[PDB]
Amino acid sequence: PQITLWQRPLVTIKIGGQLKEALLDTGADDTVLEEMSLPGRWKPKMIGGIGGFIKVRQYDQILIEICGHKAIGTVLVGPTPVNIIGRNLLTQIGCTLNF
Amino acid sequence: PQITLWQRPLVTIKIGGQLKEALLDTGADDTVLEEMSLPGRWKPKMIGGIGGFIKVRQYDQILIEICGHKAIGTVLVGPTPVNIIGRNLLTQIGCTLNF
Ligand SMILES: CC(C)CN(C[C@@H](O)[C@H](Cc1ccc(F)cc1)NC(=O)O[C@H]1CCO[C@H]2OCC[C@H]21)S(=O)(=O)c1ccc2nc(NC(C)C)sc2c1
Numbered sequence: 747p748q749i750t751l752w753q754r755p756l757v758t759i760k761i762g763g764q765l766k767e768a769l770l771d772t773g774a775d776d777t778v779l780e781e782m783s784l785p786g787r788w789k790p791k792m793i794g795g796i797g798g799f800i801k802v803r804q805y806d807q808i809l810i811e812i813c814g815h816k817a818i819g820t821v822l823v824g825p826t827p828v829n830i831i832g833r834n835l836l837t838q839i840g841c842t843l844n845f
Numbered sequence: 846p847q848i849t850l851w852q853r854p855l856v857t858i859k860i861g862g863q864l865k866e867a868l869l870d871t872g873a874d875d876t877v878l879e880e881m882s883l884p885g886r887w888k889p890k891m892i893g894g895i896g897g898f899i900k901v902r903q904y905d906q907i908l909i910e911i912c913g914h915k916a917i918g919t920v921l922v923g924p925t926p927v928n929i930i931g932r933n934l935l936t937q938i939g940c941t942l943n944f
Contacts, residue, residue, distance in 0.1 A: 749942040751932045755871050770942055771872030772854050773929060778895065795895025796877065796925055815944065826895050830872060833850040841944040843848040843869055845914065845935075 747813070757813040759831065761821065766829055768812075772843055774832030777810075778802065778822045793822060800824050815839035846912065856912040858930070860920065865928055867911075871942055873931030876909075877901065877921045892921060899923050914938035 749755045755770040762784045776793065788803035802824030810817050812831055817838035848854045854869040861883045875892065887902040901923030908917050911930060916937035 747944065751871060751935045751940060751942070754874070754932075755942055769872050771870070772850060772942070773868050773870030773872045773927075775853070793895065794926065796892070797894045797897030797899050799896045813944075827893065828872075830895075833853075836850045836944075839944050841850060841942055843850070843854055843871075843940055844943055845846065845912075845938050845940040 757831070759813075759829070760811040761808065768829035768831050770836065770841065771830045771832055772836065772841075774830045775834065776820060776822055777832040777835050778824065778826045778830045780823075780826060780829050782823055784808065784821070784823060788823070791822065793824075800826065802826075810835060812839050856930070858912075858928070859910040860907065867928035867930050869935065869940065870929045870931055871935065871940075873929045874933065875919060875921055875931045876934050877923065877925045877929045877931065879922075879925060879928055881922060883907065883920070883922060887922070890921065892923075899925065901925075909934060911938050 759768045791804045792799045802822035808821045817835045819834045858867045887904050890903045891898045901921040905919045907920045916934045918933045
């Protein structure tokens with residue numbers, strides 16, 4: 747699809763058997779999701795944003811479906827306010843910016 | 846231009862007579878720039894991101910040139926770690942997401 751930016755660019759994702767809504771975020775290196783129950787082993791990590799840092803649990807090679815496109819990569823889970831699909835997964839679904 | 850997301854989507858901007866690099870950020874509602882000297886009056890404000898909040902100075906009706914496209918809008922200035930062009934200006938330069 748082509749998405750204009752008058753509204754937040756939200757998509758439906760399916761991850762760990764659960765449906766969620768998430769922001770397509772070209773400003774995000776990595777993918778960061780609300781506290782959620784994910785299968786497998788993780789690793790503690792800290793990521794920084796505009797206001798400081800949050801602790802996240804990092805899971806590698808997780809399958810996500812992003813608006814009907816499948817990707818596999820790293821997902822971080824923690825106290826983010828919004829679910830964010832970052833460039834590590836946007837590249838896999840072929841997402842580009844155009845103007 | 847068409848920008849893929851294998852690297853950060855950075856563009857050059859000219860704002861307040863100064864040249865800066867900035868991130869095209871579909872996850873940012875507003876435009877937030879590192880500490881800089883802007884002319885005119887501002888308004889104190891607080892905005893939230895992944896790690897908490899920062900206090901910013903809000904300047905309205907600011908002219909920016911973003912990779913050769915001119916826009917006028919609100920710019921927030923404060924302790925962000927990256928210059929961020931948010932959706933208030935991305936819409937004006939006709940930026941879309943595509944996959
Ligand atoms: C997190 C999202 C919802 C908002 N954020 C933009 C995202 O694109 C941020 C942009 C950024 C890049 C780099 C940075 F160092 C800091 C910040 N990316 C991000 O946090 O990425 C994290 C995690 C992913 O992995 C990494 O990616 C790089 C850093 C890691 S925001 O900046 O906080 C921001 C912007 C404008 C704005 N206007 C408002 N208006 C209100 C009045 C409603 S609120 C608001 C908040």
